[PDB]
Symmetry: D2
Subunit: 241 residues, 4 copies
């Protein structure tokens, strides 16, 4: 139960992000989910109803981050739980990877974690309590051909999380990563390609967005106060470390 | 909710083991906790009350294992959740470590995982559902002077868990490890402020972990909310080590 | 023996970078070491002599990268061995870390690996052989207070390397990382015995590593004796961290 | 150059073990390789010639250990380099794995590392220099269906190695693990093309590894060029697994 907690979930329009937002809300938290457009934000406001609000946010833009946080502080208060879910992909074999494909991935998937974390850190340190959870990926640990950029950012946020974790652990704040394997999403939703995927998963199936949300909710709860600088893999056995 | 689930927790007399047993019971599961003596088993039956029973079990003795399981089947049924918590320590620098000190740790902390997992596996495969969770240790991952035997067993059960996880993942069965860092126990409680300081210095969180904290992690992995997690090691060490 | 091989070592002015350049040269390789200034580039030409050359290179500037590669091709040929050693630190606790301190570390310590690798890849693919070795850090694996930016970069370059390794493994090209622990440098040498004691206490080996020790590891991975090693991280930290 | 060093390589009859023995000998070390029978021991003496000797050893019999090290001290001296290569496999899905199969793997592949390391320990600490290298396996890190026992032993030896490394690092002794992926052996050579295809599909490198490649990695770690590497696992698997 998160009664009295304020949670910020970036990229909460659908799939994993939305499941996370709905789950925290269903458990008593006041949730602020974000999208890159005003309409996408409004749609989040629509489903969260009285348990939260949707706001437009660009994790690559310093002014946007500052604007959203002020709005959150004026209507709800300080963020207790930060879930960095915003992310994108720009696949290509190295030789075909554009400088922009690399930079956009680093900025959106890695630098965003730095920016959002620093932005909520202060209040958590004062309150001597907080949760920062970033959605990584199995790719960050095993790497993947054609996704060197995505893997760099996903592996990068782990090193960041470990360092930040060491800086704020004594003040009741945990910093962790939930690394999903293949998750059933609109994209994976025609049938010779799904089986090429299932073949890599011992569980024999794709994970559900709600399954990632359950793991996030666990780490965000008071039941995981002694877990920090840790990566929780949720991949059906696709990879094991 | 564990309603209808039967859980076997080895070494449930106190600390982590007891917290795990009480937590699963409090959430609807019929729990069978074990101890190495009949008296210890009775004390477990006492705190579990109508939600479970305590049984005497020696994880290094096949006859004991089969006998215990035969009893659980008779009174409750097949085990749905297995928590391998039984474990000991026989610390010593390698140059001093006696063969018995090495062997006893291997049999009790590693071979026991093999014996108990194999003993409840068949039924799980048939139901196409199950949970096997072993309590490891940060030591199995970072190593520790004076605990080469303990570290070998704790690291070894991870390799075992990963291998088993791959064999049964398609059958709706998950096999994981929860690796505690420094947890408060009777041993640590009686340490001196000076020694506790030596321990705390290694922990970014600045405190020892609670048995209940490990139990919460175990309960999460044992639930249906962790069906997509297998062959994984969940570290609960306050930042003492990070991988 | 690297006779017949052309190696590019970024940031070879001193310490680890210079040891790497001198070691590859001593073993028969034609070495091109780089620095950020003409003077630095000259110091490198000074110690490499007839076995190589120093060039000015800014790993964050595409123009510079193209210019440098063009020069190596003109005078020496295609790069067979790439050692990404260039890097910097901009330490600070998160709340005190300026955007530019984050941006600079990411561009210099991570994006640089992407840029340089991509610039030597084609020729390697064709020759069906090559070596890409990046100097990471124990910090990339264990993390470190005050170095979240540096940690993010060193951990990210591992994720990059694993991915690249998968793309080129079938073509006789290996992509690895050598992660040093505390290495002796002019800075550490200037520390008082008390200051060093804080560092030494974190290392089981009881001493700082030698720049030459990192160079030896790099030379091993760059040789033909490590053809079956790729996407791997070789830790050289005296036991400071163990994975 | 290992001139003046005495190396003990267990299970040096063929494959990885023999390559290791021949490589260390070729580089100046006096090598003692072992086999489980007198004939196998003689065959090893035959190929080592004036650079070493073959001895019959059972890494599960304490008396054999004392005896073998006894002969070694008498003829050559104290062991400076220990390579734990002896090991076996007893595959089977858990549901059908025999106690003997589990116990045999644990004793031969894990407890053996403890016994031999402990036996050569004192001499090394006294001389403030030594090398202990154990041949692990990728299966120890990734685990493998049908090899829960092999995986437990292989993962367990890393936990063991990390702990011992911590106890002896300050004394100039390093303890490491070289973890091979699929290495070409007579067993793999007899597989059908369909089977080999199954294996190759798991290796980005697109080929099986060679015994000599593992030997080169072992020789590197055993040399003075790897004195700052300890408690580390060097993966040599062609990209089969990446950590
Ligand atoms: N799907 C999988 O199998 C899988 C596996 C492992 C990890 N993940 C990770 O899980 C997370 C969810 O991504 P997804 O691909 O599953 O879902 P998705 O539907 O692609 O959602 C991405 C979300 O991020 C937001 N976003 C994109 N660029 C942004 C920017 N510059 N600033 C702020 N927000 C931005 C999007 O906003 P709009 O709604 O406005 O477009 C959207 O809400 C990602 O971090 C991803 O890397 C997914
Ligand atoms: N305390 C920590 O900080 C910490 C940290 C990491 C991991 N752990 C792990 O957590 C688990 C709990 O151990 P602990 O030391 O915390 O508690 P403990 O109080 O030592 O309890 C050990 C339990 O195991 C049982 N046991 C011992 N030998 C057995 C055998 N041969 N057969 C069956 N049961 C046996 C004991 O039975 P009796 O009650 O009959 O004696 C007791 O219930 C262990 O696996 C341990 O390695 C503990
Ligand atoms: N020292 C340690 O204990 C330790 C431990 C782990 C990892 N490392 C890593 O080892 C490597 C060596 O660094 P160091 O700190 O030991 O030595 P350093 O003396 O700081 O050398 C850094 C080198 O990188 C070059 N460089 C800096 N910014 C550059 C840029 N934008 N473009 C191109 N080159 C640039 C420098 O050029 P100039 O000579 O022109 O200044 C210099 O040659 C780094 O990647 C570092 O992260 C060091
Ligand atoms: N082949 C691979 O792909 C691969 C991959 C990863 C790791 N490995 C590891 O590499 C090592 C080499 O094994 P292998 O299978 O490749 O070669 P192998 O030809 O099976 O050789 C095994 C060696 O160990 C000795 N041995 C067996 N039981 C022993 C005992 N009780 N006491 C003393 N010595 C004993 C054997 O003696 P005899 O000659 O007298 O029979 C033989 O010399 C093993 O530790 C193995 O786990 C192999
Ligand atoms: Ca609302
Ligand atoms: Ca792929
Ligand atoms: Ca210790
Ligand atoms: Ca984990
Ligand atoms: Ca010149
Ligand atoms: Ca520190
Ligand atoms: Ca390694
Ligand atoms: Ca397999």
């Amino acid at each position: 139960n998160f009664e009295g907690k304020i949670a910020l979930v970036t990229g909460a329009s659908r799939g994993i992000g939305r499941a996370i937002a709905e789950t925290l809300a269903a458990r008593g938290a006041k949730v602020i989910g974000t999208a890159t457009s005003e309409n996408g934000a409004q749609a989040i406001s629509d489903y969260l109803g009285a348990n939260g609000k949707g706001l437009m946010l660009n994790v690559t833009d310093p002014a946007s981050i500052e604007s959203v946080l002020e709005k959150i502080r004026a209507e709800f208060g300080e963020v207790d739980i930060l879930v960095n879910n915003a992310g994108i992909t720009r696949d290509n074999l190295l030789m075909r990877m554009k400088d922009e494909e690399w930079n956009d991935i680093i900025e959106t998937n890695l630098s965003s974690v730095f920016r959002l974390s620093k932005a909520v850190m202060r209040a958590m340190m004062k309150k001597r309590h907080g949760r920062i959870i970033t959605i990584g990926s199995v790719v960050g640990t095993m790497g993947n051909g054609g996704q060197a950029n995505y893997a760099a950012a996903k592996a990068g946020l782990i090193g960041f999380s470990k360092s930040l974790a060491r800086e704020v652990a004594s003040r009741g704040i945990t910093v962790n990563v939930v690394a999903p394997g293949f998750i059933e999403t609109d994209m994976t939703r025609s049938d010779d390609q799904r089986a090429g995927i299932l073949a890599q998963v011992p569980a024999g199936r794709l994970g559900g967005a709600q399954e990632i949300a359950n793991a996030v909710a666990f780490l965000a709860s008071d039941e995981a106060a002694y877990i920090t600088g840790e990566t929780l893999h949720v991949n059906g056995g696709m990879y094991m470390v």
